[PDB]
Design a protein around this ligand. Structure first.
Ligand SMILES: Cc1cc2nc3c(=O)[nH]c(=O)nc-3n(C[C@H](O)[C@H](O)[C@H](O)COP(=O)(O)O)c2cc1C
Ligand SMILES: CN(Cc1cccnc1)c1ccc(NC(=O)C2CC2)c(C(=O)O)c1
Ligand SMILES: CCCCCCCCCCC[N+](C)(C)[O-]
Ligand SMILES: O=C1C[C@@H](C(=O)O)NC(=O)N1
Length: 363
């Protein structure tokens, strides 16, 4: 439970296991509840009301750690204020050949090209149904569940893949994410283009609206950090035109920022962690401005401290997520981020997280 011991423990495990093996093991341990339950108790300062729900704290686990919905309860126990699973594809698929995940310890970064390895909708559906009422109580308790939807590699109709995801997992989710920003599926990111995006999201929203009221999720779009100014303007325009409920900003980057030191920096894939942090923050800042602060943003990318979280909140994020920091600092990082965030909010005169959202734009 000690942040300092994990930040001896983690260096040792990483020296024993390749990152995918470590990941699979972490999912197993988490799902089994082997893990101190977090000591940090959330104060009222951290509560956020957005997307039609209460979040007891603004720090969630990003998509990709629990791709198949196996460790949801263990993740709440870790102290996350909300959990997002996925991406899930309609049919099962294996993803790319291994190795497909790489550590850049000198950069506190990871590169991955998993390629949407997924148990598929049916498996995940039954897995979530088995704990559906437990989740209903968690959500009511301020601990919401998100489901992130992807598309199969060999799919002929991308929009239909997402539509299927809405119909099958929408009823089980507090929010859905249309993931159009994975760098690891050919042609996927072009769905971020204005015409493709409008057509895709119109279909997604129609399917969502066709679900019964108590089973009707918010719909968010998750975007890349690598968008042109034109891409961002167009996404903002479509989001407001269609009434999209929120944005997740951002996925991993295909860029390789000057200064990366890791030996594996030239591996193909999406880069996450520290080198992504400010690129993500600036994308949040831009999208918040383009949407006039009217569209909830979940900020993601390189968060490993309370300062990192608050910078994204002040840039316009209502909630934040992290993943990569977990691989370097381990479970203690969740409470660390929350404790540091609370201290910083007090220091800077905010009554709570809600007061800080978008604060940079009012200065
Ligand atoms: C190993 C790995 C797998 C990921 N898988 C997904 C995914 O399946 N769907 C998705 O929307 N994002 C996925 N992501 C992106 C993360 O959700 C997040 O947007 C990105 O890693 C930036 O946050 P971070 O720096 O805290 O890790 C993945 C990231 C990593 C490191
Ligand atoms: C040890 N740990 C944190 C943890 C989380 C939940 C329960 N116990 C411990 C963890 C989890 C996932 C990891 N791998 C990855 O996720 C990589 C990106 C594929 C790593 C790693 O690569 O070193 C370490
Ligand atoms: C039929 C299912 C095909 C996809 C298998 C996916 C296995 C996922 C194992 C845990 C997640 N991880 C990313 C670490 O592989
Ligand atoms: O959305 C995604 C998909 C994931 C993968 O390759 O499965 N890799 C990522 O970095 N982001």
């Amino acid at each position: 439970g000690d942040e300092r011991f994990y930040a001896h423990l983690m260096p040792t495990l990483q020296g024993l296991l390749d990152p995918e093996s470590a990941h699979r093991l972490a999912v197993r341990f988490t799902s089994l509840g082997l893990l101190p339950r977090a000591r940090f108790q959330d104060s009222d300062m951290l509560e956020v009301r957005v997307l039609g729900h209460k979040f007891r704290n603004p720090v969630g686990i990003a998509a990709g750690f629990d791709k198949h919905g196996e460790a949801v309860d263990g993740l709440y126990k870790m102290g996350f204020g909300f959990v997002e699973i996925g991406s899930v594809t309609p049919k099962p698929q294996e993803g790319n050949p291994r190795p497909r995940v790489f550590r850049l310890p000198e950069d506190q970064a990871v590169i991955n090209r998993y390629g949407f390895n997924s148990h598929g909708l049916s498996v995940v559906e039954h897995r979530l149904r088995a704990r559906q009422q437990k989740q209903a109580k968690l959500t009511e308790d301020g601990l919401p569940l998100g489901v992130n939807l992807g598309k199969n590699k060999t799919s002929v109709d991308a929009a239909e893949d997402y539509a299927e995801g809405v119909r099958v997992l929408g009823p089980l989710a507090d929010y859905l994410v249309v993931n159009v920003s994975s760098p690891n599926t050919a042609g996927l990111r072009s769905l971020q283009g204005k015409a493709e995006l409008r057509r895709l999201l119109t279909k997604v929203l129609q399917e969502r609206d066709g679900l019964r009221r108590v089973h009707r999720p918010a719909v968010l779009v998750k975007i890349a950090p690598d968008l042109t100014s034109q891409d961002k303007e167009d996404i903002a325009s479509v989001v407001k035109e269609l009434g999209i409920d929120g944005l997740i900003v951002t996925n991993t980057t295909v860029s390789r920022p000057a200064g990366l030191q890791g030996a594996l920096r030239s591996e193909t894939g999406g880069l996450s962690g520290k080198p992504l942090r400010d690129l993500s923050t600036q994308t949040i800042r831009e999208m918040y401005a383009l949407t006039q602060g009217r569209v909830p943003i979940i900020g993601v990318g390189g968060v490993s401290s309370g300062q990192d979280a608050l910078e994204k909140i002040r840039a316009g994020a209502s909630l934040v997520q992290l993943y990569t920091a977990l691989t370097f600092w381990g479970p203690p990082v969740v409470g660390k981020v929350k404790r540091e965030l609370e201290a910083l909010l007090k220091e800077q005169g905010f009554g709570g997280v809600t007061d800080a959202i978008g604060a940079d734009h009012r200065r």
